[PDB]
Design a protein around this nucleic acid. Structure first.
Ligand SMILES: [K+]
Ligand SMILES: [Mg+2]
Ligand SMILES: [Mg+2]
Ligand SMILES: [Mg+2]
Ligand SMILES: [Mg+2]
Ligand SMILES: [Mg+2]
Ligand SMILES: [Mg+2]
Lengths: 216, 103, 34, 121, 122
RNA sequence: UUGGCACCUCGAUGUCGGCUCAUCGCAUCCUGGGGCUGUAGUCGGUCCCAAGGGUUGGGCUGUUCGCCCAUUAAAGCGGUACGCGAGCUGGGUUCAGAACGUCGUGAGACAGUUCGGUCCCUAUCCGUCGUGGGCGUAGGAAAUUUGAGAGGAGCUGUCCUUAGUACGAGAGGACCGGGAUGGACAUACCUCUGGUGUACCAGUUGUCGUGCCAACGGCAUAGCUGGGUAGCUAUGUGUGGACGGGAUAAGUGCUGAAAGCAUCUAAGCAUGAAGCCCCCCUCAAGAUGAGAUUUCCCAAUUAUAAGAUCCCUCAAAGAUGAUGAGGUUAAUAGGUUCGAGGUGGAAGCAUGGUGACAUGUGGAGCUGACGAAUACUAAUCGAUCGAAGACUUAAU
């Protein structure tokens, strides 16, 4: 199949042929390169390891991730590249194709295709039990002291434990979610943009992962 | 909207430079084309401009009218292809920029 | 809501492994007064 | 920006206006870290009115600067408003912004609070 | 929006003038209704002399709202009051003459008998 | 279930419904398979397999339960101190007051009905949801990963065309298989519709401060009213439910013995259910059974190398730790100069009006959180940890 990586930029709309509105996100995807093709004889699985954004070169008093390091730099130039920031493996794609050290163009995505998107969520901190799991809150008048709280937790002296898959507060946020079966609207080539019908996860300037759908 | 200018460039050939100008409280007519078959007609909406927000393709307004006792309102995008033309025929004076005291 | 038992001498001291303090930095004695 | 400093709106708008003034007179003060990262901005927006010097800026150079302090420097009397447009504005006619400077002293004795200096440059 | 214990009005020549909504005809615990929706009502105020007296349960149909409808072309239409029209077993109206406009969505809603009679469709 | 017995508890096992949460069992209420008949067709009826999921809003009296209007694919019976009061309520329940009736010679009762009437606790241990420091994984470190195993999603309806053909005495009615549009539910997001927006913009009353001109500020719920940027949000905006396969219940069968014939199970053997494992999403090598690649670093006890941390500037992250962006060869936050989006035409002079006012110079001026460019301010200074490939037993 086919797969490209890129950053989420924003969200707008376009007018179709029948004047209909279609809402879209705007994915930027430049500078992808193949760095290691795999094998079953070595690893046990065929795949394609890909890296997306460029960064700078080795430096002596190095105290960021802007400037790369030697193990990285010894992996870019191998396949004749520059140091790459992000790295991912794609596993469901044909490997007789995709020779090494090349680039990957958006042009391999037509307009009107079908995809599935994969990214990170947004961050909510320490949150309660009815924003999170979304369940009923209690009376606020008629002499009541139960407003926002999880009521009960167990039964009685039978089953005196508390089962594990139980709903309490804590942290929800930067988890991995996917979205199935969206549509490809339009594909620029100069600005290196791909548009998708619908809204997809993550914050602005984040990272997005795009791949062909497997379903029918 | 110069963020890195990648969104206000793609959405460039969906604009249109055909449309006159208008502030709130400026009567104007709106020649829609409505499709209910192999081919169908126009059916104007007339009224008075109360609202206008935004910038870009997502720039909207709305107009008010009374019709046989009842009030009605319709809000439109500016750059859609349905709207053949706009015809500003009168102009006024106000001190507000959102009008809701008209109900 | 009330302790049912006594806290031993160990469980009191197994707990204070992390209840210490820390050291300042060290610039040439000179302070790290950025 | 957006710091509240455990002080509700009606209080913070008057604490940041006293800091901007008494500074100007003595050009050097001693505060906690947080406050001086907020008069880092209020006072830098307040010389930029002093280079114009027009009749309108004096009218918006008074809605935050503080009531007429009858100074007394060497054999004289000033106002904090006929010192800001006459004297600081003239030293600083050819630089861009950035005319403050924060400096870290140590902590305090009682409440264990980082103490810093702030001056003009 | 139109839910239980809601008071619409009437725009036909059939005697019933005001009503009260007590249901919506979906069924999986549905809790609202917009334009184009068959409901159940009663009467709370009639006109002397007519065909639908006070205290009679009847089914009825929306024709107007304060919340509009989201046309697929990216367009919206919201009126300034609410309204209803009273119907029969044969999927058609009790009275004859319609008053006040209606909404074009009623063409693809099998209510063509009412656009067949009304002054201003819009 | 109403009970019988009186084995724990009276130096306290302290409570009937309803609200919030959930969890198991089938002797199945709906959906799912089929057999059976008077089921011609529909509609059922009967028994058989099946627990994956699903299982309504309101009126009267305390109402546990009871009756009634109105909808629904359907509006299930039982368990878990008649599930849950160190999580909520207190109508009901037996307190002291006072009426009304049966009773008593009187103290008072049997309540046969009504009205009024103080809810104590800073969570130690286990259990549970979430997040981190320390050793270990036969040299040390930076990136990418396999997946033994564990959890999660799982629902359904109507129109119409299929197709009036199999079948149906004809009307009626499938199989087939095509979509179209939906209700409830579960998840990401803010372009639209809209809600808030306490350091943003105009308007507006009262009173203190400049012996007043009002152009300004302070307090009076932000003094009130009209609007509203970034940001988090749903009543808004878009996807999802799977099909598909491997076999198994009842039940349909074929060769085929039983006993010639027979016969669905006996040697055989195809068939077939929303159920079961596989397919779809998420976490996972503390998986002490501690994995697999890729590249980088290499000694005179002992310094130090690859490489990380202290420390300072900040958010796309956040209770604190941690994660992430950047540290003068530098665009990190602030500021300054330009833009956007929002408000709705300043001050100050100049014409017109006796006057309070309106026009023009000018889509004016101001603008917190978003975007860009620019070294003017500060990220200085400098310190601290940190590896030198064991042994057999084989092949080399
Ligand atoms: K109720
Ligand atoms: Mg109380
Ligand atoms: Mg320090
Ligand atoms: Mg008994
Ligand atoms: Mg018993
Ligand atoms: Mg005995
Ligand atoms: Mg005062």
């Amino acid at each position: 199949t086919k797969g490209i990586l890129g950053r989420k930029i924003g969200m707008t709309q376009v007018f179709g042929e029948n004047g209909e509105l279609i809402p879209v996100t705007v994915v930027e995807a430049k500078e992808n390169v193949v760095l290691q093709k795999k094998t079953v004889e070595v690893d046990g699985y065929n795949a394609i390891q890909v890296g997306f954004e460029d960064k700078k070169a080795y430096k002596k008093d190095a105290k960021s991730n802007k400037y790369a390091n030697k193990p990285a730099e010894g992996h870019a130039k191998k396949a004749d590249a520059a140091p790459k920031r992000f790295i991912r493996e794609f596993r469901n794609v044909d490997v007789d194709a995709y020779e090494v050290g090349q680039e990957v163009s958006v042009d391999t995505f037509v307009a009107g295709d079908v995809i599935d998107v994969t990214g990170v969520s947004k961050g909510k901190g320490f949150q309660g039990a009815i924003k999170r799991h979304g369940q009923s809150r209690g009376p606020m008048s008629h002499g009541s002291h139960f407003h926002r709280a999880p009521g009960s937790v167990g039964m009685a002296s039978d089953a005196s434990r508390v089962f594990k898959g139980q709903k309490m507060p804590g942290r929800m946020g930067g988890n991995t979610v996917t979205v199935q079966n969206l549509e490809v609207v339009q594909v620029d080539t100069e600005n290196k943009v791909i548009l998708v019908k619908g809204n997809v996860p993550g914050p602005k300037k984040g990272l997005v992962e795009i791949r062909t759908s497997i379903k029918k | 909207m110069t963020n890195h200018k990648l969104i206000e460039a793609v959405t460039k050939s969906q604009l249109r430079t055909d449309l006159p100008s208008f502030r709130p409280g400026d009567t104007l007519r709106v020649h829609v084309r409505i499709i209910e078959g192999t081919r169908e007609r126009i059916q104007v909406f007339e009224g008075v401009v109360i609202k206008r927000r935004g910038g870009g393709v997502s720039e909207t307004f709305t107009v008010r009218k009374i019709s046989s006792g009842v009030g009605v309102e319709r809000t439109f995008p500016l750059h859609t292809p349905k709207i053949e033309k706009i015809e500003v025929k009168r102009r006024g004076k106000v001190r507000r920029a959102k009008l809701y005291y008209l109900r | 809501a009330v302790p049912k038992r006594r806290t031993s001498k160990t469980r009191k001291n197994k707990r204070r492994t992390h209840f210490k303090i820390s050291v300042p930095g060290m610039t040439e004695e000179y302070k790290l007064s950025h | 920006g957006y710091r509240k400093l455990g002080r509700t709106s009606d209080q913070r708008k008057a604490m940041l206006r006293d800091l901007a003034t008494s500074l100007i007179i003595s050009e050097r003060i001693e505060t906690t870290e947080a406050r001086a990262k907020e008069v880092r901005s209020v006072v830098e927006k307040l010389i930029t009115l002093g280079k114009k010097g027009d009749l309108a800026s004096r009218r918006n150079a008074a809605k935050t600067l503080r009531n007429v302090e009858i100074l007394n420097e060497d054999e004289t009397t000033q106002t904090a408003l006929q010192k800001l447009f006459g004297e600081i504005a003239e030293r600083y006619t050819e630089r861009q912004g950035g005319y403050t400077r924060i400096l870290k002293q140590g902590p305090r004795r009682g409440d264990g609070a980082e103490s810093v200096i702030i001056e003009l440059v | 929006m139109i839910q239980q214990e809601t008071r619409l009005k009437v725009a036909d020549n059939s005697g019933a003038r005001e009503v009260l909504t007590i249901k919506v005809l979906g069924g999986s615990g549905r809790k609202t209704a917009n334009i184009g929706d068959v409901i159940v009502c009663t009467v709370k105020n009639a006109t002397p002399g007519g065909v639908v007296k006070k205290g009679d349960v009847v089914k009825a149909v929306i024709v107007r709202t304060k919340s509009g409808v989201r046309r697929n072309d990216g367009s919206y239409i919201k009126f300034d009051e609410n309204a209803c029209v009273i119907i029969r077993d044969d999927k058609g109206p009790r009275g004859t003459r319609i008053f006040g406009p209606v909404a074009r969505e009623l063409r693809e809603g099998n209510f063509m008998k009412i656009v067949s009679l009304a002054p201003e469709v819009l």
